[PDB]
A paper describes a structure:
However, in the presence of sub-inhibitory concentrations of ERY, ribosomes translating the ErmBL leader peptide become stalled, leading to an alternative stem–loop structure in the mRNA that exposes the RBS and start codon of the ermB gene and thus allows ribosome binding and induction of ErmB expression. Previous studies demonstrated that polymerization of the ErmBL nascent chain halts because the ribosome is unable to catalyse peptide-bond formation between the 10 amino-acid-long ErmBL-tRNAAsp (codon 10) in the ribosomal P-site and Lys-tRNALys (codon 11) in the A-site9. Here we present cryo-EM structures of the ErmBL-SRC in the presence and absence of A-tRNA at 3.6-Å resolution, which were used as a basis to perform extensive molecular dynamics (MD) simulations. In conclusion, this study illustrates how ERY exerts a dual effect on the PTC to inhibit peptide-bond formation, namely, by (i) restricting the path of the ErmBL such that orientation of the P-tRNA is perturbed and (ii) stabilizing the A-site crevice to prevent movement of the A-tRNA towards the P-site.
Numbering used by the authors:
A (entry chain BC): 2 to 272
B (entry chain BT): 1 to 93
C (entry chain B2): 1 to 46
D (entry chain B5): -8 to 0
Amino acid sequence: AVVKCKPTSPGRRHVVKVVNPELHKGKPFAPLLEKNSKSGGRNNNGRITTRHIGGGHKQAYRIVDFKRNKDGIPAVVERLEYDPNRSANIALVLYKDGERRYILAPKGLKAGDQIQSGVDAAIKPGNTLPMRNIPVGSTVHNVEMKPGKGGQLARSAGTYVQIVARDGAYVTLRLRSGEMRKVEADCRATLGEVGNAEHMLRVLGKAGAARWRGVRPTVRGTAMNPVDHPHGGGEGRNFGKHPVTPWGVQTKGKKTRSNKRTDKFIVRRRS
Amino acid sequence: MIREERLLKVLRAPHVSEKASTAMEKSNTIVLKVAKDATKAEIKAAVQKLFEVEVEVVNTLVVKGKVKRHGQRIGRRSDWKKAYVTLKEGQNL
Amino acid sequence: MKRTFQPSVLKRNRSHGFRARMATKNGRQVLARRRAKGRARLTVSK
Amino acid sequence: AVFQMRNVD
RNA sequence: CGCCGGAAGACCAAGGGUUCCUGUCCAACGUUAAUCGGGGCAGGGUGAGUCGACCCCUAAGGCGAGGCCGAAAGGCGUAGUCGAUGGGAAACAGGUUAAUAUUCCUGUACUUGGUGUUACUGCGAAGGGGGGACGGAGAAGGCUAUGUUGGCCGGGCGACGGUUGUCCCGGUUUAAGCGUGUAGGCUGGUUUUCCAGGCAAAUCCGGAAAAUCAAGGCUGAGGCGUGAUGACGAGGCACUACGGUGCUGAAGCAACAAAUGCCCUGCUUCCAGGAAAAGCCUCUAAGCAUCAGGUAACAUCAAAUCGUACCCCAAACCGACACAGGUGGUCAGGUAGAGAAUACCAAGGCGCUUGAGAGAACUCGGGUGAAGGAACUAGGCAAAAUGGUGCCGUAACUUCGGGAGAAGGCACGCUGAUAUGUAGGUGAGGUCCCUCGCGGAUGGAGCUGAAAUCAGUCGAAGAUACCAGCUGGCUGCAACUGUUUAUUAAAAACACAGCACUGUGCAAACACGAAAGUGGACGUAUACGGUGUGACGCCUGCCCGGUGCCGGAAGGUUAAUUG
RNA sequence: GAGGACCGAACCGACUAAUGUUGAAAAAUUAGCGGAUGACUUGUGGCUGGGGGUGAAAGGCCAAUCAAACCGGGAGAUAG
């Protein structure tokens, strides 16, 4: 339930906060917390391998149970909690043995829900069961790319992946990008979709809003110099040159992809 | 500990001064130079036998040698360790 | 105006101390030249 | 101080 | 006499390295003379179980057994190790020196270990859990540092009209520790049984069933006692190298105000969701199991090594100088005031290492000026002016927050009365209730104290000093807050949220690196990179010939290769 | 009690003008100014090393020097 900010002073007028009242305010479940120091975008060489990354508020990473290895055991939600690292909300479910692990939150999730991973598990949202048991066309997220590896697919908020086919050991998936890709049926996946569909609505609303996100200001290359960027000079803005990356790779209209090994999995290019 | 021979070199020379004389007539703490190393305990044992008097408490400090110079050439002196051996009611010489 | 020289003994020994010369093969060669040249101070410290 | 500038006549 | 007094006072770290103290000296050092000095020479000075370092632990990182990789040098990195700007046990008052004091002395203490005696008893990791362990902003409340007034004690009857009184001056200071556990804050406690969890196990944590009871516990300033029969103490008695040393030494209370300090690592609230490990509290395992060990009372021993002087916004550090520059943290008095602004003062430190004159131009820093009031000038440049609080009132326009303190005015001192000090705030005695405490109600003295009305009064001027917005209109540009050529350009330039295009399915694209390995990211197309444009509103037309690129695979053309 | 909110010290920044120009100072002082709860400032300690680094982009900055730092070497380079 987004609420547009009132125009009290500049840098506040355009802001649109995305409040989430059902979230449980308070200190995070401490033992699973661990350090996540900012890299600054630099590597071991100390070179800036990736620009426009630095600064921002400190963040603490939290482990999440992608594998859902505890099959059979019933689980119950305790409370939703904010995750700085990801657009998707995370929830601290309570296993019957008393063990606790974070999990991505399905749109149908509420406090006290009886979600349960397992091969024999009933088909309700929030469950994580292998796709071989999954009916065609159901909304699916957190799909493993490899058997038991975790679930790299559809981790982002509002994402969902339909399963349009099941022929062979593989099961075809419909990615949010619209790109088609085969995946083995043995891989685990979560039913339904993550509920943070309101995430796109945020618009920051000020120049300093990106500063805590670790984002750094972008300098266009036409404003630069020929020695620093291929674009530049010309005395008074200008342009002329065909657009390019600073390292000279052609921007706009050049597929940089070159994997070959994974082309077998690519049923179709994204549209 | 003793090892009598190590103890003997600790008491290389007494260090008389106008301030030290006041320490003996009032605080009853004899003042003398000691070895560059050693410890509070070894200095105490040196007084227990050779000075044949009981020690109350030992205190130590290190005065840095003042730099000297003559022309472009310079000549730093040498460091030495002062010590404060407080004496009990049994003090003599 | 602030001077370029802003002394700190802790930074000095870490950057220009005898230990830094031994940190790499290139640094050990630096000491070798000072010795053949003859010097009162192979490095600097206290 | 020496300065710089240019003598463009 | 004059200056600072949120410092030009005081302290620590950084850094400097005897500049500290004393005697003596004046060649050179000091922008002058110099008996003086941060100068020459010599002597003296730095006292630690509990201040800090060392030590234990860890961040960003560095190094790195093997290993991976690279012509060689070398690069990366595991287990490890190092790394404070962090965390981790414990000393406070008085006195003394020419210079050092939480170090020595005096008084009262405290922590962690070794050993011994006695009592009780399941003790034991590199492991599990708990704890340590943390954000921004805001709101007050309860207190202390500290201040004012009164009381008390000691001293003073005034160089000139008054001053034995409602007068003047000074003091009224006391810590750690220990006992007490309040103002508050947090949480329902105890017991029994069971478990797919916490790599092994578990009495601990967690989960599940019951029973019982309602206050069980933790945290916590400060106050009150003790510490304190003292110590300090204005001022005297006494010797006196006139630089001081011994002895004695009165009162040592109350009320109010009160913080930026404390309770507070709290509470409330908001996204931007807020280090790491050890010490510490517990749990067992491999084990010992009458032991060793564990806990408690007493006694004893040990707490080493190193720093400790001086300078600390400067004459000593950094600036070639005894240089109008630069340098982090801590201590925060009186009056006025919103205030750490500013003026005058306390404590305290200084009059800044050339002076004495003369009173020309001209120059620099200021004051005032009759008449005019931008006529000056590239240009209202510079000066001048506006300036506070309370109240009245305030247009076009707008994204309905603005514009706006728009503009434009009134009131402002002192004294009396309302009320010999009011509204309020603080709060004693008396009275009563108490599972009886640092209680509550009742009660209202005393103290403190604005703001207002009326009347009177003085000056040319009462926000009188310092302090302290000039305002309005049209328009260009950029949305705005910011950032930018350190050392001639602060802008229309850059950034900007937003919009769009394009690349990317994860061992991603991209980037560093001959590689290995990292970053992206411990992210997953609502994500990330690149490019363009630059809030918002109205929108964003046409052209693919040329150039670039995508898509397409027959044909034309064509390399190494085959010969 | 919200704000890259308002006035305004510390703090940070350096728009105007005078003085200074072998200055007290190889960029300061004086009288005004901007920001001052944040895209803030700063202490301490690390990281990126020369055709490279870093840059809210001035080709600025990298020890008073930067359209390619400094040191040593080739080197007594070449110079019609």
